[PDB]
Amino acid sequence: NFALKPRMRKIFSRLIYIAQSKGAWILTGGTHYGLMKYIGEVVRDNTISRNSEENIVAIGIAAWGMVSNRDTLIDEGHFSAYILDNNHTHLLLVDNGCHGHPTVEAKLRNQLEKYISERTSQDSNYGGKIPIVCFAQGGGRETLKAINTSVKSKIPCVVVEGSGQIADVIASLVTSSMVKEKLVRFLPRTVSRLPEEEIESWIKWLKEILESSHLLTVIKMEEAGDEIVSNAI
Amino acid sequence: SYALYKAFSTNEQDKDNWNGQLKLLLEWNQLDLASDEIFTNDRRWESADLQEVMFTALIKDRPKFVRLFLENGLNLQKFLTNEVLTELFSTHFSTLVYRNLQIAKNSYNDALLTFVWKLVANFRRRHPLQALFIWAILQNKKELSKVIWEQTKGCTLAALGASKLLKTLAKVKNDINAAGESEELANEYETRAVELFTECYSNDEDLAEQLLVYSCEAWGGSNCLELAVEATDQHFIAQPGVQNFLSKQWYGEISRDTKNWKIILCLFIIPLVGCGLVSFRKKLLWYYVAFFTSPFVVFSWNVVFYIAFLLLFAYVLLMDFHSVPHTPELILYALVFVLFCDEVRQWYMNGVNYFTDLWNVMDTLGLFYFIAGIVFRLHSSNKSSLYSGRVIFCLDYIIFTLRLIHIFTVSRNLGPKIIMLQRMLIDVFFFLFLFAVWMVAFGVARQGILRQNEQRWRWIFRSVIYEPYLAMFGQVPS
Amino acid sequence: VFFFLFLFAVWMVAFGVARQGILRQNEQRWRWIFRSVIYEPYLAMFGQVPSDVDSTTYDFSHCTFSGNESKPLCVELDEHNLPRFPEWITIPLVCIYMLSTNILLVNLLVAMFGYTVGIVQENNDQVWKFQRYFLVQEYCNRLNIPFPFVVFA
Amino acid sequence: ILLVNLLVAMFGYTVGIVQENNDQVWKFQRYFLVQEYCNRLNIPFPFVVFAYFYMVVKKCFKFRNEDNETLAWEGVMKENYLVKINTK
Amino acid sequence: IAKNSYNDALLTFVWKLVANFRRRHPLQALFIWAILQNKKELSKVIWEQTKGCTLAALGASKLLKTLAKVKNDINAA
Ligand SMILES: O=C1NC(c2cccc([N+](=O)[O-])c2)=CCN1c1ccccc1O
Ligand SMILES: [Ca+2]
């Protein structure tokens, strides 16, 4: 699910407006579920309003192990009603063995992020180097794993909000004790299916998050006017 | 409500009962509480289970909860089936509103009302969101209407059709409070339509002109511009975007930024289309056809022809009129036959509303008096029939000449003043009533004091009415 | 003014040709076409009330019977040497015309003048002292002496 | 004098009413003449009767994607307009 | 379209200079550049730097009142 309050709606419409303004790629999960549905909707909206001047590029990266209807051709396919979203203009699905395998796309995804972060292209104002921003707004294991995979790598540029599940627990604090304190008060019904043998691991995850706080930034509640996304990025 | 929610939630058994808490916070107006601690954790949204609570939020005037349910995921057209709509128009449709609808259908009947009477007579016994918008808009709900208006596809057509329905139902005379609310809601939606279309035109011109002409696959079976006209929404057409559309459709292929004297001078000098004095932006025979296709020059050619027709009519009627028709009389009959074919074509393309306009009525009247003048005129060897035929042609010339006013309403300067002229008829008839009263009073007083027992009706009415009538132009009776 | 002249020309031509067609028969002189179609309905704007429509105040001493001398033609006669034109169709026609031009169409012009004065007055001080520039510049540019003597310079 | 100069005053007041509406009423009436001169496949008028015989020649013998596209266009400025209302 | 249909002295002057530079009072030339494009906020920033301030404001007012008469693209008008 995705709790679509109009604030995050405005933020992501502004975001895809910035992506059309600068001619950027966006990378996302690419399934037809939750946020990527709405992101594909806004991609279709800005595509259908102007239809030119650097039409935007969304790449969805999926795992191929959760996909319901899978077809093999060389000759176009027809996917119909995890489910892929219909509005992402490019899709990539990683190869593995069986179906019961989440988090398989993450290694190739982060390796691709690292390669563009070390890709040299001097035709910009960033000293070449093609600047990369990561966004966290929701919650889950894959969020924290991707943020630590980013911040361990060079140039993560992680941006968070002050609303959600893990966005609240990173946005509030800026040792093990305070991590536990905010983690139990902001996520009541997710710890109830969790052992502490990985909760100490999550403490290690967030200690590797907060190791470099200059590579992290936050969108606040008082910062809620116009062009706050540009002020963040 | 908060106390009952706290006692209902902490009973250690129904902590998982989200439906009961939702129905409880729906029966009261706790929007913020249901936003904060029902729809927060993203833990259980089935998105097809929200149907009964949607039906309840509709039938009990809960606009913020239906806004919240559509915000948190519920497709209307999936929800809004025929059983739902028959239950709304059957059970939850008020019975005073239906009486106002009968009175409006019997006394202020119209095309859009016949359409909505057909569909409301359907569902008491496919574009569904517009049907539920009609449901909410008739009941004067005023806040469920906007929530469902924002979900609609044909937005400006919805706003114009709702404005027209409410401007009709504001005329039903009993229950003037409902008339007042429907009048306010009509003004609100016509403002909304104007303000949305000026944004759509300001961001792009070509696609807004795409919007003006579309039919919504039978919204009410009509068009955005047609619904603006039929409600007399003369602020929607007075805005610069629709005026730009009208003038671009009026000049045709000729670009609007060429001066009018160049156009009419190239009209008189016919082969001068092959020069750079007109601009055809908006090989050489294409210039020829693209000049002679546009509405501006076929109208101007048509008024030149009509002036020459009136000069021929005047020549034939005054200076060349004998027992047998000469050649110019027969040419005159031919031109009136051309005008007759034009009017029967316009009746064939219009039908009943052809007789709506006054100008087509007097147009039919003038054609009938012309053929009456023909059938009186052909009885040769009879002086009375020939002279009566000429009298009929003279009165018909009065009619044909007065039509020229309505011809020349198209100017930027003659136009508004000819429109202003026809708003004066109530002052003219007030003046004629009072002048008739004073005239009859003085006429009978003078004719009774002076004379004694006139028996001739002509010399009654020449001395009672006619001389006090001439005493209005300063004659001072003798 | 030109709006008034357009509408008055339309009404004037309509009534003029109607009266000249009902009364007379086949005038051939263009001067006595345009004196009786345009000129007398024009004078009916200053309150003249056109004359030869009454059939009782109409004497035959102002006719010609044929186009021979100055005066207009007679109305075309009956076989009993009587005027053929109905009073019941020429009397109310003169009444309708005289009402519609001498009262309605003039007092429309009065109203349009009143409204135009009501528009342009709060601008009219600005328009006057804008036009003042042009006369000040044409009288200050030239090295001007008195006018009769200007030819010497 | 009295009854005529009453009519002068009533005309003056009616012109004073309907003038700020009169530009709107003129360019509302403009619709009707533009629609009667753009609807017909019109040639010059004297010759129009010939094409009426061609009408007799007729009597001698006798969901779409871009509309959804422009409605989807309209929805964007609907959202923009609603944002502007709530920004007021 | 404005030079062919609403011709004037100041427009012939700016048409001469804009036909010059597509093939000395420079700030007024850049003010004409920004003022023609309807930039509306670069114009004021460069207006404040100008010497002949009121002449700049009157000449810009005259150019824009001319270009508001061009009939196509009424939004730019
Ligand atoms: O088409 C036309 N038909 C008649 C007409 C035709 C037959 C009889 C009568 N009539 O007697 O009033 C009028 C009126 C004038 N007219 C016209 C010509 C040029 C421009 C605009 C126009 O409306
Ligand atoms: Ca007609």
mmCIF file of N, CA, C and O in Angstrom, chain B residues 150 152-153 155-156 195 199-200 203-204 207 211 214 217 229 234-235 237 243 247 249-250 295 298-299 302 305 338-339 342 345 409 411 416 419-420 423 427 430-431, chain D residues 3 6-7 10-11 14-15 18-19 21-22 24-34 37-38 40 42-46 58 63 67 70 73-74 77-78 81-82 84:
data_model
loop_
_atom_site.group_PDB
_atom_site.id
_atom_site.type_symbol
_atom_site.label_atom_id
_atom_site.label_comp_id
_atom_site.label_asym_id
_atom_site.label_seq_id
_atom_site.Cartn_x
_atom_site.Cartn_y
_atom_site.Cartn_z
ATOM 1 N N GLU B 150 -14.408 16.766 -9.074
ATOM 2 C CA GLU B 150 -12.970 16.616 -9.252
ATOM 3 C C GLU B 150 -12.568 15.265 -9.817
ATOM 4 O O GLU B 150 -11.457 15.140 -10.330
ATOM 5 N N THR B 152 -14.252 13.714 -12.248
ATOM 6 C CA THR B 152 -14.887 13.555 -13.540
ATOM 7 C C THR B 152 -13.860 13.791 -14.649
ATOM 8 O O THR B 152 -12.837 14.442 -14.443
ATOM 9 N N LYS B 153 -14.118 13.233 -15.831
ATOM 10 C CA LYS B 153 -13.252 13.457 -16.987
ATOM 11 C C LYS B 153 -13.639 14.712 -17.765
ATOM 12 O O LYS B 153 -12.815 15.607 -17.970
ATOM 13 N N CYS B 155 -14.714 17.740 -17.440
ATOM 14 C CA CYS B 155 -14.893 18.632 -16.307
ATOM 15 C C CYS B 155 -15.702 19.870 -16.654
ATOM 16 O O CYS B 155 -16.671 20.189 -15.955
ATOM 17 N N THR B 156 -15.328 20.575 -17.720
ATOM 18 C CA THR B 156 -16.039 21.795 -18.068
ATOM 19 C C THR B 156 -17.421 21.502 -18.624
ATOM 20 O O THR B 156 -18.341 22.301 -18.430
ATOM 21 N N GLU B 195 -13.483 29.831 -15.085
ATOM 22 C CA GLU B 195 -12.130 29.901 -14.553
ATOM 23 C C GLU B 195 -11.284 28.702 -14.920
ATOM 24 O O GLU B 195 -10.064 28.829 -14.989
ATOM 25 N N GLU B 199 -7.755 28.912 -17.775
ATOM 26 C CA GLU B 199 -6.470 28.280 -17.505
ATOM 27 C C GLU B 199 -6.070 27.350 -18.633
ATOM 28 O O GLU B 199 -4.921 27.391 -19.097
ATOM 29 N N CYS B 200 -7.011 26.509 -19.076
ATOM 30 C CA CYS B 200 -6.739 25.605 -20.187
ATOM 31 C C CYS B 200 -6.398 26.343 -21.468
ATOM 32 O O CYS B 200 -5.599 25.841 -22.257
ATOM 33 N N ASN B 203 -2.701 28.004 -21.064
ATOM 34 C CA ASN B 203 -1.549 27.116 -21.147
ATOM 35 C C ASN B 203 -1.334 26.580 -22.556
ATOM 36 O O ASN B 203 -0.196 26.333 -22.954
ATOM 37 N N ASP B 204 -2.404 26.403 -23.322
ATOM 38 C CA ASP B 204 -2.293 25.938 -24.698
ATOM 39 C C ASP B 204 -3.532 26.387 -25.452
ATOM 40 O O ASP B 204 -4.628 26.371 -24.894
ATOM 41 N N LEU B 207 -5.195 22.773 -27.960
ATOM 42 C CA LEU B 207 -5.935 21.743 -27.255
ATOM 43 C C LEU B 207 -7.162 22.296 -26.545
ATOM 44 O O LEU B 207 -8.142 21.568 -26.359
ATOM 45 N N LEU B 211 -10.999 21.102 -26.890
ATOM 46 C CA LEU B 211 -11.978 20.885 -25.824
ATOM 47 C C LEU B 211 -13.328 21.507 -26.128
ATOM 48 O O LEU B 211 -14.361 20.956 -25.738
ATOM 49 N N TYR B 214 -16.182 19.086 -28.240
ATOM 50 C CA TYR B 214 -16.346 17.651 -28.062
ATOM 51 C C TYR B 214 -17.631 17.331 -27.320
ATOM 52 O O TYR B 214 -18.163 18.161 -26.584
ATOM 53 N N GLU B 217 -19.226 11.753 -25.616
ATOM 54 C CA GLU B 217 -19.962 10.552 -26.005
ATOM 55 C C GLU B 217 -21.331 10.525 -25.326
ATOM 56 O O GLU B 217 -21.664 9.606 -24.580
ATOM 57 N N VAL B 229 -24.286 28.082 -24.623
ATOM 58 C CA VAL B 229 -25.255 28.938 -25.297
ATOM 59 C C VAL B 229 -26.647 28.739 -24.722
ATOM 60 O O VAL B 229 -27.340 29.705 -24.394
ATOM 61 N N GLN B 234 -23.547 33.973 -21.080
ATOM 62 C CA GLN B 234 -22.886 34.945 -21.927
ATOM 63 C C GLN B 234 -21.629 35.521 -21.308
ATOM 64 O O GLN B 234 -21.027 36.418 -21.896
ATOM 65 N N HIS B 235 -21.223 35.048 -20.141
ATOM 66 C CA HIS B 235 -19.892 35.362 -19.666
ATOM 67 C C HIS B 235 -18.877 34.330 -20.111
ATOM 68 O O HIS B 235 -17.682 34.630 -20.143
ATOM 69 N N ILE B 237 -18.784 33.071 -23.161
ATOM 70 C CA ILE B 237 -18.427 33.335 -24.544
ATOM 71 C C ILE B 237 -17.788 34.708 -24.696
ATOM 72 O O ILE B 237 -16.999 34.918 -25.627
ATOM 73 N N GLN B 243 -13.664 33.974 -27.942
ATOM 74 C CA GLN B 243 -13.719 35.004 -28.972
ATOM 75 C C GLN B 243 -12.615 34.828 -30.003
ATOM 76 O O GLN B 243 -12.839 35.055 -31.195
ATOM 77 N N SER B 247 -13.342 34.247 -33.956
ATOM 78 C CA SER B 247 -12.789 35.081 -35.013
ATOM 79 C C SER B 247 -11.859 34.293 -35.924
ATOM 80 O O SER B 247 -11.801 34.564 -37.126
ATOM 81 N N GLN B 249 -12.418 31.236 -36.657
ATOM 82 C CA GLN B 249 -13.301 30.457 -37.497
ATOM 83 C C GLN B 249 -14.072 31.337 -38.461
ATOM 84 O O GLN B 249 -14.575 30.844 -39.472
ATOM 85 N N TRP B 250 -14.146 32.632 -38.179
ATOM 86 C CA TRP B 250 -14.843 33.590 -39.024
ATOM 87 C C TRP B 250 -13.989 34.111 -40.162
ATOM 88 O O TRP B 250 -14.484 34.227 -41.281
ATOM 89 N N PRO B 295 -15.620 32.577 -44.494
ATOM 90 C CA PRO B 295 -16.953 33.120 -44.205
ATOM 91 C C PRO B 295 -17.057 34.620 -44.373
ATOM 92 O O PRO B 295 -18.133 35.110 -44.735
ATOM 93 N N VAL B 298 -17.682 35.511 -48.156
ATOM 94 C CA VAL B 298 -18.955 35.073 -48.705
ATOM 95 C C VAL B 298 -20.082 35.872 -48.073
ATOM 96 O O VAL B 298 -21.062 36.217 -48.745
ATOM 97 N N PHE B 299 -19.907 36.300 -46.822
ATOM 98 C CA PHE B 299 -20.861 37.219 -46.220
ATOM 99 C C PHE B 299 -20.828 38.580 -46.894
ATOM 100 O O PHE B 299 -21.880 39.177 -47.146
ATOM 101 N N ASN B 302 -22.399 38.446 -50.152
ATOM 102 C CA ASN B 302 -23.827 38.265 -50.027
ATOM 103 C C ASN B 302 -24.525 39.586 -49.707
ATOM 104 O O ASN B 302 -25.632 39.842 -50.199
ATOM 105 N N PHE B 305 -24.721 41.551 -53.058
ATOM 106 C CA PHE B 305 -25.841 41.027 -53.830
ATOM 107 C C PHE B 305 -27.179 41.504 -53.297
ATOM 108 O O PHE B 305 -28.087 41.796 -54.077
ATOM 109 N N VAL B 338 -34.398 32.490 -55.625
ATOM 110 C CA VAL B 338 -33.127 32.096 -55.011
ATOM 111 C C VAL B 338 -33.193 32.253 -53.495
ATOM 112 O O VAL B 338 -32.782 31.359 -52.736
ATOM 113 N N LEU B 339 -33.745 33.380 -53.037
ATOM 114 C CA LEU B 339 -33.928 33.594 -51.599
ATOM 115 C C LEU B 339 -34.893 32.581 -50.992
ATOM 116 O O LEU B 339 -34.722 32.156 -49.841
ATOM 117 N N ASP B 342 -33.020 29.354 -50.471
ATOM 118 C CA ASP B 342 -32.197 29.514 -49.272
ATOM 119 C C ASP B 342 -33.011 29.311 -47.998
ATOM 120 O O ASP B 342 -32.569 28.616 -47.072
ATOM 121 N N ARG B 345 -34.009 25.689 -47.495
ATOM 122 C CA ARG B 345 -32.838 24.944 -47.042
ATOM 123 C C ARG B 345 -32.599 25.155 -45.554
ATOM 124 O O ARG B 345 -32.268 24.211 -44.828
ATOM 125 N N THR B 409 -25.679 43.517 -38.213
ATOM 126 C CA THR B 409 -25.301 43.422 -36.808
ATOM 127 C C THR B 409 -23.867 42.967 -36.597
ATOM 128 O O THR B 409 -23.442 42.860 -35.447
ATOM 129 N N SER B 411 -20.922 44.318 -37.366
ATOM 130 C CA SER B 411 -19.834 45.259 -37.198
ATOM 131 C C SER B 411 -19.411 45.346 -35.749
ATOM 132 O O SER B 411 -20.156 44.998 -34.837
ATOM 133 N N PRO B 416 -23.249 46.462 -31.419
ATOM 134 C CA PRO B 416 -23.779 46.680 -30.067
ATOM 135 C C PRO B 416 -24.910 47.673 -30.007
ATOM 136 O O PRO B 416 -25.790 47.535 -29.157
ATOM 137 N N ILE B 419 -28.041 45.978 -31.114
ATOM 138 C CA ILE B 419 -28.495 45.164 -29.986
ATOM 139 C C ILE B 419 -29.166 46.024 -28.920
ATOM 140 O O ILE B 419 -30.218 45.657 -28.383
ATOM 141 N N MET B 420 -28.597 47.189 -28.632
ATOM 142 C CA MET B 420 -29.152 48.108 -27.647
ATOM 143 C C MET B 420 -30.507 48.647 -28.072
ATOM 144 O O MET B 420 -31.355 48.928 -27.223
ATOM 145 N N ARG B 423 -33.655 46.581 -26.964
ATOM 146 C CA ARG B 423 -33.973 46.560 -25.545
ATOM 147 C C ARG B 423 -34.889 47.699 -25.141
ATOM 148 O O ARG B 423 -35.091 47.916 -23.945
ATOM 149 N N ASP B 427 -40.072 50.412 -23.052
ATOM 150 C CA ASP B 427 -40.257 51.850 -22.894
ATOM 151 C C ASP B 427 -41.145 52.415 -23.990
ATOM 152 O O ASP B 427 -41.981 53.291 -23.727
ATOM 153 N N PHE B 430 -44.702 51.419 -23.108
ATOM 154 C CA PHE B 430 -45.182 52.241 -22.006
ATOM 155 C C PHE B 430 -45.593 53.627 -22.485
ATOM 156 O O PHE B 430 -46.661 54.138 -22.104
ATOM 157 N N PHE B 431 -44.759 54.239 -23.330
ATOM 158 C CA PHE B 431 -45.092 55.526 -23.927
ATOM 159 C C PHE B 431 -46.357 55.449 -24.759
ATOM 160 O O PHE B 431 -47.182 56.363 -24.721
ATOM 161 N N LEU D 3 -44.619 63.909 -21.540
ATOM 162 C CA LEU D 3 -44.661 62.491 -21.839
ATOM 163 C C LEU D 3 -43.574 62.072 -22.815
ATOM 164 O O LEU D 3 -43.193 60.900 -22.830
ATOM 165 N N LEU D 6 -40.274 62.229 -20.663
ATOM 166 C CA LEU D 6 -40.171 61.035 -19.841
ATOM 167 C C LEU D 6 -39.536 59.892 -20.621
ATOM 168 O O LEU D 6 -38.717 59.137 -20.079
ATOM 169 N N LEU D 7 -39.911 59.750 -21.894
ATOM 170 C CA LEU D 7 -39.372 58.678 -22.722
ATOM 171 C C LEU D 7 -37.894 58.877 -22.995
ATOM 172 O O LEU D 7 -37.141 57.899 -23.071
ATOM 173 N N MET D 10 -36.169 57.610 -19.897
ATOM 174 C CA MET D 10 -36.180 56.158 -19.768
ATOM 175 C C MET D 10 -35.231 55.501 -20.761
ATOM 176 O O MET D 10 -34.580 54.503 -20.430
ATOM 177 N N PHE D 11 -35.121 56.058 -21.969
ATOM 178 C CA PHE D 11 -34.112 55.582 -22.910
ATOM 179 C C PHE D 11 -32.707 55.821 -22.390
ATOM 180 O O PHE D 11 -31.835 54.956 -22.535
ATOM 181 N N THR D 14 -31.956 53.266 -19.736
ATOM 182 C CA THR D 14 -31.791 51.907 -20.242
ATOM 183 C C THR D 14 -30.458 51.746 -20.967
ATOM 184 O O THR D 14 -29.808 50.700 -20.853
ATOM 185 N N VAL D 15 -30.019 52.784 -21.684
ATOM 186 C CA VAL D 15 -28.681 52.771 -22.275
ATOM 187 C C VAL D 15 -27.621 52.733 -21.183
ATOM 188 O O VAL D 15 -26.617 52.018 -21.296
ATOM 189 N N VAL D 18 -27.590 48.952 -19.968
ATOM 190 C CA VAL D 18 -27.250 47.764 -20.731
ATOM 191 C C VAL D 18 -25.924 47.918 -21.451
ATOM 192 O O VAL D 18 -25.546 47.050 -22.234
ATOM 193 N N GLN D 19 -25.169 48.978 -21.170
ATOM 194 C CA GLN D 19 -23.969 49.178 -21.969
ATOM 195 C C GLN D 19 -22.791 48.340 -21.493
ATOM 196 O O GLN D 19 -22.097 47.734 -22.318
ATOM 197 N N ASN D 21 -23.024 45.588 -20.079
ATOM 198 C CA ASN D 21 -23.391 44.261 -20.522
ATOM 199 C C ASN D 21 -23.412 44.155 -22.041
ATOM 200 O O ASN D 21 -23.346 43.048 -22.564
ATOM 201 N N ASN D 22 -23.460 45.283 -22.754
ATOM 202 C CA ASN D 22 -23.820 45.272 -24.167
ATOM 203 C C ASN D 22 -22.692 44.737 -25.029
ATOM 204 O O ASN D 22 -22.944 44.116 -26.064
ATOM 205 N N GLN D 24 -20.809 42.293 -23.928
ATOM 206 C CA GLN D 24 -21.012 40.860 -23.736
ATOM 207 C C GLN D 24 -22.176 40.348 -24.560
ATOM 208 O O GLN D 24 -22.114 39.244 -25.101
ATOM 209 N N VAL D 25 -23.244 41.134 -24.668
ATOM 210 C CA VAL D 25 -24.418 40.660 -25.389
ATOM 211 C C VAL D 25 -24.138 40.650 -26.880
ATOM 212 O O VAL D 25 -24.567 39.733 -27.589
ATOM 213 N N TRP D 26 -23.352 41.610 -27.367
ATOM 214 C CA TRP D 26 -22.948 41.587 -28.764
ATOM 215 C C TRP D 26 -22.073 40.387 -29.066
ATOM 216 O O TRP D 26 -22.337 39.643 -30.018
ATOM 217 N N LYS D 27 -21.045 40.156 -28.256
ATOM 218 C CA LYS D 27 -20.190 39.028 -28.583
ATOM 219 C C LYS D 27 -20.757 37.701 -28.111
ATOM 220 O O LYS D 27 -20.139 36.666 -28.349
ATOM 221 N N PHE D 28 -21.920 37.702 -27.468
ATOM 222 C CA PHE D 28 -22.694 36.479 -27.347
ATOM 223 C C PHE D 28 -23.523 36.233 -28.597
ATOM 224 O O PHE D 28 -23.610 35.098 -29.073
ATOM 225 N N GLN D 29 -24.143 37.282 -29.141
ATOM 226 C CA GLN D 29 -24.914 37.149 -30.373
ATOM 227 C C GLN D 29 -24.042 36.834 -31.573
ATOM 228 O O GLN D 29 -24.550 36.324 -32.575
ATOM 229 N N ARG D 30 -22.751 37.157 -31.487
ATOM 230 C CA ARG D 30 -21.794 36.887 -32.554
ATOM 231 C C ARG D 30 -21.685 35.401 -32.874
ATOM 232 O O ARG D 30 -21.452 35.028 -34.038
ATOM 233 N N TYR D 31 -21.860 34.558 -31.850
ATOM 234 C CA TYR D 31 -21.896 33.107 -31.999
ATOM 235 C C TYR D 31 -22.876 32.664 -33.067
ATOM 236 O O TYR D 31 -22.568 31.771 -33.857
ATOM 237 N N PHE D 32 -24.053 33.276 -33.113
ATOM 238 C CA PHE D 32 -25.117 32.747 -33.952
ATOM 239 C C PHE D 32 -24.842 32.995 -35.420
ATOM 240 O O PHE D 32 -25.074 32.116 -36.257
ATOM 241 N N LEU D 33 -24.300 34.161 -35.751
ATOM 242 C CA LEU D 33 -24.002 34.419 -37.150
ATOM 243 C C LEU D 33 -22.767 33.654 -37.595
ATOM 244 O O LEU D 33 -22.729 33.156 -38.728
ATOM 245 N N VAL D 34 -21.779 33.492 -36.706
ATOM 246 C CA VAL D 34 -20.622 32.672 -37.054
ATOM 247 C C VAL D 34 -21.036 31.220 -37.266
ATOM 248 O O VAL D 34 -20.569 30.555 -38.199
ATOM 249 N N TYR D 37 -22.904 30.862 -40.668
ATOM 250 C CA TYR D 37 -22.062 31.024 -41.843
ATOM 251 C C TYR D 37 -20.893 30.060 -41.901
ATOM 252 O O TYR D 37 -20.195 30.028 -42.916
ATOM 253 N N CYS D 38 -20.658 29.275 -40.860
ATOM 254 C CA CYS D 38 -19.611 28.270 -40.909
ATOM 255 C C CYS D 38 -20.152 26.854 -40.985
ATOM 256 O O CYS D 38 -19.393 25.935 -41.303
ATOM 257 N N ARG D 40 -22.810 25.666 -42.967
ATOM 258 C CA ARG D 40 -23.110 25.292 -44.334
ATOM 259 C C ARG D 40 -21.839 25.279 -45.174
ATOM 260 O O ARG D 40 -20.912 26.059 -44.944
ATOM 261 N N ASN D 42 -20.786 26.666 -47.878
ATOM 262 C CA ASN D 42 -21.310 27.788 -48.621
ATOM 263 C C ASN D 42 -20.417 28.329 -49.708
ATOM 264 O O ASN D 42 -19.228 28.597 -49.517
ATOM 265 N N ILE D 43 -21.032 28.440 -50.867
ATOM 266 C CA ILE D 43 -20.454 29.096 -52.019
ATOM 267 C C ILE D 43 -21.091 30.506 -52.025
ATOM 268 O O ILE D 43 -22.068 30.791 -51.310
ATOM 269 N N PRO D 44 -20.738 31.308 -53.039
ATOM 270 C CA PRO D 44 -21.368 32.628 -53.163
ATOM 271 C C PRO D 44 -22.876 32.393 -53.331
ATOM 272 O O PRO D 44 -23.269 31.388 -53.923
ATOM 273 N N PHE D 45 -23.702 33.303 -52.816
ATOM 274 C CA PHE D 45 -25.165 33.138 -52.809
ATOM 275 C C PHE D 45 -25.968 33.004 -54.117
ATOM 276 O O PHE D 45 -26.871 32.171 -54.190
ATOM 277 N N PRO D 46 -25.660 33.805 -55.149
ATOM 278 C CA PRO D 46 -26.479 33.635 -56.355
ATOM 279 C C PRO D 46 -26.376 32.217 -56.911
ATOM 280 O O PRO D 46 -27.352 31.639 -57.390
ATOM 281 N N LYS D 58 -27.797 14.269 -54.414
ATOM 282 C CA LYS D 58 -27.791 13.360 -53.269
ATOM 283 C C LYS D 58 -29.104 12.592 -53.202
ATOM 284 O O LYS D 58 -29.119 11.362 -53.062
ATOM 285 N N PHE D 63 -14.018 6.538 -26.768
ATOM 286 C CA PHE D 63 -13.375 5.275 -27.110
ATOM 287 C C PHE D 63 -12.164 5.518 -27.998
ATOM 288 O O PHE D 63 -11.208 4.751 -27.984
ATOM 289 N N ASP D 67 -9.294 11.659 -28.173
ATOM 290 C CA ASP D 67 -10.274 12.315 -27.316
ATOM 291 C C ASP D 67 -9.997 11.994 -25.851
ATOM 292 O O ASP D 67 -10.046 12.885 -24.991
ATOM 293 N N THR D 70 -6.972 14.199 -24.949
ATOM 294 C CA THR D 70 -7.192 15.589 -24.570
ATOM 295 C C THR D 70 -7.985 15.714 -23.279
ATOM 296 O O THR D 70 -7.812 16.703 -22.561
ATOM 297 N N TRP D 73 -5.373 15.463 -20.891
ATOM 298 C CA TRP D 73 -4.713 16.760 -20.833
ATOM 299 C C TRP D 73 -5.454 17.705 -19.909
ATOM 300 O O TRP D 73 -4.827 18.379 -19.091
ATOM 301 N N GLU D 74 -6.786 17.740 -20.022
ATOM 302 C CA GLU D 74 -7.607 18.671 -19.251
ATOM 303 C C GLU D 74 -7.487 18.423 -17.756
ATOM 304 O O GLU D 74 -7.494 19.373 -16.958
ATOM 305 N N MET D 77 -4.661 20.487 -15.895
ATOM 306 C CA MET D 77 -4.933 21.850 -15.479
ATOM 307 C C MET D 77 -6.095 21.927 -14.523
ATOM 308 O O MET D 77 -6.215 22.929 -13.821
ATOM 309 N N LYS D 78 -6.953 20.908 -14.487
ATOM 310 C CA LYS D 78 -7.894 20.795 -13.381
ATOM 311 C C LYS D 78 -7.162 20.725 -12.056
ATOM 312 O O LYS D 78 -7.474 21.475 -11.126
ATOM 313 N N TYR D 81 -5.527 24.093 -11.351
ATOM 314 C CA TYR D 81 -6.521 25.068 -10.932
ATOM 315 C C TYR D 81 -6.966 24.840 -9.496
ATOM 316 O O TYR D 81 -7.162 25.800 -8.742
ATOM 317 N N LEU D 82 -7.110 23.575 -9.094
ATOM 318 C CA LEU D 82 -7.499 23.274 -7.721
ATOM 319 C C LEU D 82 -6.407 23.664 -6.740
ATOM 320 O O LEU D 82 -6.695 24.189 -5.653
ATOM 321 N N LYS D 84 -4.360 26.095 -7.262
ATOM 322 C CA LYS D 84 -4.405 27.554 -7.193
ATOM 323 C C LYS D 84 -5.520 28.050 -6.278
ATOM 324 O O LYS D 84 -5.319 29.017 -5.530
#
